[PDB]
Amino acid sequence: ILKSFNYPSASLICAKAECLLRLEELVRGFLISKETLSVRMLDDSRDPTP
Amino acid sequence: LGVAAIFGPSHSSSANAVQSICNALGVPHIQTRWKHQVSDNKDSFYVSL
């Protein structure tokens, strides 16, 4: 879908660490960076505003 | 046989099974190698080294 968006600078937000396994093919298929894909994960209190 | 703590194993899936057999029964599971910990595991009865 991203390649049909011409690979814009994404930002995966994963609720739990298991996302990195659930989406391993996407994370390792990209170049993790500030301008390509940055994986930010929700914390303990589950407040996503920061 | 009656034990006091159950060390090992080393693989992640086998380690997780023994860790919940213990967390249930209440004897300490004292691991040695890193395992894939599930994020919602409410097991109080295990100790990693």
Side-chain angles (χ1 to χ4, degrees), chain A residues 4-50:
Chain A
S4 185
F5 283 171
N6 309 272
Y7 284 139
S9 39
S11 182
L12 169 55
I13 301 184
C14 310
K16 280 161 12 248
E18 267 118 46
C19 128
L20 263 186
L21 185 131
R22 178 83 159 83
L23 299 193
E24 180 172 12
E25 194 37 65
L26 166 64
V27 164
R28 87 156 149 83
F30 266 20
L31 177 63
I32 319 294
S33 88
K34 183 71 66 65
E35 302 106 1
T36 311
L37 161 71
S38 18
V39 178
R40 335 183 110 87
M41 297 180 147
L42 264 227
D43 42 78
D44 42 357
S45 71
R46 310 180 217 188
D47 204 38
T49 170

Side-chain angles (χ1 to χ4, degrees), chain B:
Chain B
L1 192 40
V3 291
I6 286 156
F7 303 120
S10 276
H11 196 55
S12 89
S13 158
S14 158
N16 272 337
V18 185
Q19 173 210 353
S20 193
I21 285 266
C22 286
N23 192 31
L25 267 164
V27 299
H29 182 239
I30 308 166
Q31 320 178 350
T32 62
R33 212 196 304 273
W34 180 86
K35 72 184 188 82
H36 170 230
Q37 186 173 355
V38 208
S39 158
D40 61 332
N41 210 6
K42 316 279 192 166
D43 308 341
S44 55
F45 269 61
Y46 83 113
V47 163
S48 175
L49 259 299

